[PDB]
């Protein structure tokens, strides 16, 4: 069922989103372990360790990306708490393959895989693969690929 | 056997009342082959 999910193992290992019958998360939250669900066991369909992305049940369905103009929201899936959204204007990680939108939001480990959404409520990527700055501040990429 | 599972918790939506927070930083990074971003 389409929506935002917690990944459990009890304690929360991460989060992700079901869209068009496919479950999407960061690779590192499960490392490709199968996932039990209300619809039976889900098996990893495609994953990239380099990109830290993983989907179950079929190919990557998330087709939208940050437009480079607008603020975005993270649906923060904090362990032990109802979800709450936070809004921010991304900066960027500057890499050779183009800029990647990046958010200065610092939440607990159980939150990796929480979705980032645009104003239309479309998922433009996931939280939780980034860098620690020399001053200790955390910045995550908006982690995304093509559908 | 796996010891992991998923639990649905919320709709995918934009919240009109969300707190605005954070900053727009610009940082040079490379992504290594095991998926770790590295500061440059």
């Amino acid at each position: 069922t389409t929506g935002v999910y917690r990944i459990m193992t009890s304690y929360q290992a991460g989060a992700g989103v079901m869209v068009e019958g496919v479950f999407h998360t960061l690779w590192h939250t499960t490392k490709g372990a199968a996932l039990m669900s209300g619809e039976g066991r889900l098996d990893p369909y495609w994953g990239s360790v380099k990109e830290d992305r993983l989907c179950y049940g079929g190919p990557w369905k998330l087709q939208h990306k940050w437009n480079g103009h607008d603020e975005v929201q993270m649906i923060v899936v904090e362990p032990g708490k109802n979800v709450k959204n936070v809004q921010t204007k991304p900066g960027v990680f500057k890499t050779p393959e183009g800029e990647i939108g990046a958010v200065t939001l610092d939440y607990p480990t159980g939150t990796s895989g929480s979705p980032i959404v645009d104003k239309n409520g479309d998922v433009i990527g996931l939280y939780g693969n980034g860098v620690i700055m020399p001053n200790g501040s955390y910045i995550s990429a908006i982690v995304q690929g093509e559908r | 056997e796996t010891d992991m599972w998923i639990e649905r918790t919320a709709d995918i939506t934009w919240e009109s009342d969300a707190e605005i927070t954070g900053s727009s930083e610009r940082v040079d990074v490379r992504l290594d082959d095991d998926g770790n971003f590295q500061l440059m």
Partner: peptide, 4 residues
């Protein structure tokens, strides 16, 4: 650290 670098991931969440």
């Amino acid at each position: 650290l670098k991931r969440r």
